[PDB]
Design a protein around this ligand. Structure first.
Ligand SMILES: CNC(=O)c1ccccc1Sc1ccc2c(/C=C/c3ccccn3)n[nH]c2c1
Length: 276
């Protein structure tokens, strides 16, 4: 296997983001002076197969807006999955703490374009994402945004993936058919993407603010949808609302979504330069 490394090339430091990602540590790949992120797994565990599965998935996936695997150490008790280090952390915290004059309207469009690009790639590859949200997107330099591979699952048959029995997902990001039946399709991801667009537009506000979890499904079933946040362009809100169609088949594909954002991003860019 080309991906294998020797664990002593890595200098391990402290847990990233106060443990919000679980067992992921800042590390240094000594012979490149390169900071990295290192997912680790205790040796006393029953999750070895799942963890190797994550690695195998990471081997198959490659895209500029998906967090990149760098190497694994999987022949010795503490298993490692080493990924690139994203210096600005998760996108949700980034949006909340950022200078909004730097991270302005055009940057927001750019971030959405990047994520939609990643999702269109996954769509074509017959993958779905079980955890599409701002908190699971990572930010590097120059407003580079990548979706984390955590939550990625490949469809072996059909267009639906069923989450492990008893699974509990965050209600406010989850498509109603997924809440109801535990089925995730790429259309469920389109729903989640609409919510992510709302997280971006509001600089990291919680969705359905003030609304209690217990009411969300019924409210959605009865056509309740979040309103347009101030500052949000109408075309972006319309796309958001297209993502929140009750029937999965009425939602646009990520190909259509990415193309819409690419077009809007270009027009803003062109209009930006035209102003001198
Ligand atoms: C086991 N958990 C995961 O694999 C996971 C889940 C959600 C999102 C990501 C990951 S893996 C991961 C986590 C953090 C990172 C980072 C940087 C984290 C960070 C966080 C705060 C401040 C600065 N940096 N770079 N690359 C990463 C890869």
């Amino acid at each position: 296997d080309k991906w294998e490394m020797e664990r002593t090339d890595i200098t391990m430091k402290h847990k990233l983001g106060g443990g919000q990602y679980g067992e992921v540590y800042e590390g240094v790949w000594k012979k490149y002076s390169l900071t990295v992120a290192v997912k680790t797994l205790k040796e006393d565990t029953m999750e070895v197969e799942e963890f190797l599965k994550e690695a195998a998935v990471m081997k198959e996936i490659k895209h500029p807006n998906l967090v990149q695997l760098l190497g694994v150490c999987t022949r010795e008790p503490p298993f490692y999955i080493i990924t690139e280090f994203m210096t600005y952390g998760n996108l949700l915290d980034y949006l909340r703490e950022c200078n909004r004059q730097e991270v302005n309207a055009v940057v927001l469009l750019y971030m959405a374009t990047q994520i939609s690009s990643a999702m269109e790639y996954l769509e074509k590859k017959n993958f779905i994402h079980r955890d599409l949200a701002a908190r699971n997107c990572l930010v590097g330099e120059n407003h580079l945004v990548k979706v984390a591979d955590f939550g990625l699952s490949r469809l072996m048959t059909g267009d639906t993936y069923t989450a492990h029995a008893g699974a509990k997902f965050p209600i406010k990001w989850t498509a109603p058919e997924s809440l109801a039946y535990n089925k995730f399709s790429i259309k469920s991801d389109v729903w989640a993407f609409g919510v992510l667009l709302w997280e971006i537009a509001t600089y990291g506000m919680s969705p359905y603010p003030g609304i209690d979890l217990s009411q969300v499904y019924e409210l959605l079933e009865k056509d309740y949808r979040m309103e347009r946040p101030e500052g949000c362009p109408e075309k972006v809100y319309e796309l958001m609302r297209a993502c929140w169609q009750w029937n999965p088949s009425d939602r646009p594909s990520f190909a259509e979504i990415h193309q819409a954002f690419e077009t809007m991003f270009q027009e803003s860019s062109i209009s930006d330069e035209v102003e001198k």
